[PDB]
């Protein structure tokens, strides 16, 4: 069998936490001063909450109330955790390749390669193990909230196994971990994690006699960051394509449009997802790679894994003829400066039909169809 | 339309870098004092505050400032540069009574996850092109700064090498290197020194000198280390594996002891991989393993050898299934992980090291592949 | 989501209004097979076990209605013991026929009042909302493959429905939901499998994307169907039988009318026009109005609309639909072949673009006359 | 060249109304007994006969007979006229156990379907010209021959209005009355009392007086109700809604309980475009939402405003999302559908009814949709 698997984490898990924080104190910054420069970093462990990094800006973000944000609705209070501030300036030496003297150009805020990736198994373009990795857990944490499942915490996993042996994929496992109060009904819980795996396979029309692992350690009630210490970009293939996609190593949460590892990202699965939905081929992974203060990518590699319908050579053409290589350009077109990146910080960056995301827009089909042509 | 893969490396006084040098060595001194150590430590470092923080429970003592400075010292920085945070915790109760099985014999996976192990034939060190030769730059730059061939540096840097994969041979595209530099230096000669060193390395591996060079894009480096920019334990995990040509399940190595299986089956994946691709059965060769915590041996394992296999790929797949043993306790005794030191693979990554000598780079299964793959 | 997401649908041969539709056009068929000049208005109740036939029928014709109900619901799996059947056949009225049948001038009057819509659009080669081609194309193949035998365990009564989203350019699928009524002992793995792979054969078949939702017997159990779930009725499925929702409705239903019927014979003509406007480049979409009173010959009023689609001069195309076209309702009648023309087919799967069958109101006949009087 | 839109209406004697005003008369007696009531009552009427058919399952008892004699009475019919037929199956479980579900705070939708909501500010109604005034007419004639006003006329009767848009005042093209008349009438006392009535409605709007006048155009319209022509339930459904200016997905209203869709969803969408437009949003709005069997909410949605938005169009979306609960349960108890007499909607339409008080002509969503479209 070929069993390939991707997993999730839940709003309450550390290192989303810290995602979250990074996310939650840029948008505030871009709210009121879409130029800001923000680099912003946070660590979670036991009782200590560090909010870190270079913000240059001016802006006035409270990090306090905009942690308190984050952990409150996660059943956190006010005496839970010491709040460390160290906010930075930008390096000058940075910024001034970033900000170019022709000032409609943007120098890349550092060198680094991204991936954007895209393929036809989902309506979302996505691998379907991170699809379904996600449902599972945007659900239970629906439930969770509206008290259709009670006695349970925030802090959450999920893995999920598909068969891709034969032409219609198998669910070969769910499995899930749920933070659970000491007094927890160990049956009922089962049951209603069993439901909800059993709803979502259904939702997308799948087989329901997968196996299932539950709470495999058998005790979860120590959860959060007093039971593993998070840190921002420390889940950065939940946050992309669930290991099916590569991945450069950069991570998207705290960071403003001028931080390609972020920004180029976004544009790459933008293309790679409109290459897909043109059915210009079946899987699409672009490459792109920067350099510091250069405004457009070194290089780039179209790779369609022998699923193309149409010539790569002329894949390539088109993605180039229907494209804006340049920063600046891109970042505008995906109206980045006005983005609130605080919804992608949890449930992943990419194929969210829950959001309503610039990337993610199948507006490049028709160009590529024109320009791909004989 | 040439085909042009990117990856990267960083330098011993990268912030991120720092981070998983203090993160390990603080790992080596809890297991030379106590073998059944656990251990999961993380460390930010931003502009004058590094903090050590994670979940240890162990019978060593560990001096974490002593143990920053060893880090910190020989990349210049000096006792009153930064203040230092130490909370550390003890591991959940709760994870602990999964890994640590009441049987005695097993050890249950630390965590549920997603391992990629790979490998190739295009180097000595069956590893991508572009990561070795982009590790293999800055480790030259770092001993000659140390030696002080090169002078009127300093120890943050980075590089990026993209390599043309167009025809059988593969070329040099380009080499880029970053280096923090001091203000009073001499522009001709730092340049001369680095066009020199990447020629040298070029033809260490026979390849072209006629390759295009970007040195010090930005124009100005003298801001670095966590002044320049926020540092973060597992927050370089491309560079630390494959350079984006292998697949990554997004967990960090630094700072964990073999209990936590985001390492230790990763090494093991690169292990296997390794050896397929050394016994002959394929040319590349890359193993995907998934893990549920408490049980002790992998949930899911998946082979690929993209088209390169020699013999049939189901041949493979038996042949390693036959040729390894998959018991997480086993496997870290195999590979002899409670006694490696890994201070020595957190900077310049942790795979084909032909400069270390690894349990997870020994050539030692060839046999049993062969055999088993009748 | 920020999306155009228009959706149609269909429904089956075994769906209890279409077996209506179906009773009341088999009926007409067989009273204009032997009488040219009959008046026919047949409206058809199915309810659990009774089916009426009912309406206004002045002919020389007889029809029995008992047979001709068997020839719809035998072939769906009931037979001559499942319905009680009531046969309530008024006449015409003579106060209508005399409006009508203008002797004096050679003329027909409209069979009533009413607003019937024409429309025509270039999205598929039948000149249909491609939503609207994709449900019905869903149920032909499902009941293809009931009545050869590769898809088993299945009945007659099912219903499709199809979401496109047209935000950009290129349509792409958004969502098929099909339910299908099936035995109690089906085999839900082979049943969702089927239905999967007609999904996407219908997809390919349009050159379209394969990766959209499915939703397939959502309600979870359809054992219990036809008329004993649900009462059918004639002229219920009207959106079904026109243009899925695209189009505009004036509220006239089809089946079980003579071509005197303007609801009927209008319609037929003005989706004529639209269709032959949009095959000659004037417009990529296409509604015409038509307005009528009861006695009149004519059309009281008429309204094109082009939808900002119109590539010359709305008032050309307006112009040029004139000069092509003949309004007077004996003239476009005897020019459809209405008296001479099969019902029964249409009412299943729709009344217009149907590149199965070969109907008078969908020949491109005027594409040459329309381009010509547009200059 | 004249842009002319038509839309009809038709009398309480019509036999299609006749259907449709038993059909809601019977489901009126059913909720006033059992509020869980399932009802889905179809109604012929042809020549002698009428047969009261659907599926009903209830705790009530409706004497279905007497019933359809207090709708056939007021129209001039007495007991011994028609055979009646009484045909009421149950409600089939295989829909029930769909809808009722076993988590008993939602109701699944009662049938796949689309459906359309309509609003312009044309007229005070919110609805278009040429519907309000057809049905003015013939409310009007109505309103006369009980009154004995105008003499010698029977109840079945049709209108049809043509409204000429070419300028930015609409001007009256034509009205068009048919009403079935005595044996014995005066035809010049008979023109003259429609013609003033034609007028009369003119001038209560506003609008010319030289409009074409089509009067009895059959020239004798004796014969009528059932015995001149076959009614049906739901035969209507363009005269019930927006006069053919509105989209219509094809469902009808009259004799279904809430939990059918085609009814209450149809109800939900008109309130928000009525509010939509009420709130300025645009001058038009339509729309469209769509459902499937089992599901507690619709499966797709679309909103029309025809270019005449006068904000962004995703502002407006956005407003209605943040307005409005898309629960079926949730929207049928925020209209009172339960508790809604739908005898007074089976005549003169559905909408705009400023002789009523319905739950879902009420304006009390415009400050919600104004405040939430900043
Ligand atoms: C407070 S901000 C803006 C002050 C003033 N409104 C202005 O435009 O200069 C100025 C600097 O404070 C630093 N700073 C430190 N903590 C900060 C915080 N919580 N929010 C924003 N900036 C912060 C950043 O480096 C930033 O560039
Ligand atoms: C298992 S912990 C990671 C290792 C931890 N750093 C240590 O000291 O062993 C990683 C994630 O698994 C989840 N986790 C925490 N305690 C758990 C338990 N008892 N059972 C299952 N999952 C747990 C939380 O989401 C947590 O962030
Ligand atoms: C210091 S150790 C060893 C003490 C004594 N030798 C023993 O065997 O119990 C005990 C605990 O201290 C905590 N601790 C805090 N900081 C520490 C440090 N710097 N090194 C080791 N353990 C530390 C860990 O949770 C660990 O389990
Ligand atoms: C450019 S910085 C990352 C973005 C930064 N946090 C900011 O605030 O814009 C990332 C890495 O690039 C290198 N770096 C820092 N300053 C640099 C410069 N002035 N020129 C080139 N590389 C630099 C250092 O290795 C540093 O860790
Ligand atoms: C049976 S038809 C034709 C009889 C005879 N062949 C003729 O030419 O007079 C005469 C009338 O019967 C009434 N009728 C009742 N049931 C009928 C049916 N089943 N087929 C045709 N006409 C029917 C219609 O109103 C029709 O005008
Ligand atoms: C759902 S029924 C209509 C409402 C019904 N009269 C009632 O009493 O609730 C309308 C159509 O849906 C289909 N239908 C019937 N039973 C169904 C079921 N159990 N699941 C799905 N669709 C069904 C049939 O095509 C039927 O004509
Ligand atoms: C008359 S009601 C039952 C009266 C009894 N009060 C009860 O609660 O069960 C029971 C069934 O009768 C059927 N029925 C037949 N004709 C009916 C009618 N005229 N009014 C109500 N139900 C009728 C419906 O299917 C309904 O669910
Ligand atoms: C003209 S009839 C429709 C077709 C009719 N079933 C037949 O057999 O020809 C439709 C509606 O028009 C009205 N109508 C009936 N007889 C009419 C007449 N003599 N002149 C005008 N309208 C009439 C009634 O309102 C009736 O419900
Ligand atoms: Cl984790
Ligand atoms: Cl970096
Ligand atoms: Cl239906
Ligand atoms: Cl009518």
Known sequence: KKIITSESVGAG?????????????????????????????????????????????????????????????????????????????????????????????????????????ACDETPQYMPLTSVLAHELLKEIERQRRSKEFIKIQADMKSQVSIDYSNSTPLIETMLVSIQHDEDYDVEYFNKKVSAIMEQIAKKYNLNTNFKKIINSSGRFVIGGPIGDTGLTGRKIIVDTYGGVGHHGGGAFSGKDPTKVDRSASYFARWIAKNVVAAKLAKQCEIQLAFAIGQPQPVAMYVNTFNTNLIDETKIFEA??????????????????????????????????????????????????????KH
């Open 13 to 117: 898990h550390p290192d989303k936490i810290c995602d979250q924080i990074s996310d939650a104190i840029l948008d505030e910054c871009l709210s009121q001063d879409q130029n800001s420069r923000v680099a912003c970093e946070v660590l979670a462990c036991n009782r200590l909450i560090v909010i870190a990094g270079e913000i240059t800006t001016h802006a006035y973000v409270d990090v306090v109330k905009t942690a308190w944000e984050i952990i409150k609705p996660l059943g956190y209070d006010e005496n839970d955790f010491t709040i460390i501030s160290n906010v930075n300036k930008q390096s000058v030496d940075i910024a001034q390749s970033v900000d170019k003297t022709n000032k409609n150009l943007i120098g890349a805020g550092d060198q680094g390669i991204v991936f954007g990736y």
């Open 319 to 372: 993605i180039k003829k229907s494209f804006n290589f340049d920063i600046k350009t891109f970042i505008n077109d995906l109206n980045l400066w006005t983005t609130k990146y605080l919804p992608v910080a949890t449930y992943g960056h990419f194929g969210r039909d829950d959001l309503d995301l610039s990337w993610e827009k199948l507006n490049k089909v028709e160009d590529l169809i024109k320009n791909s």
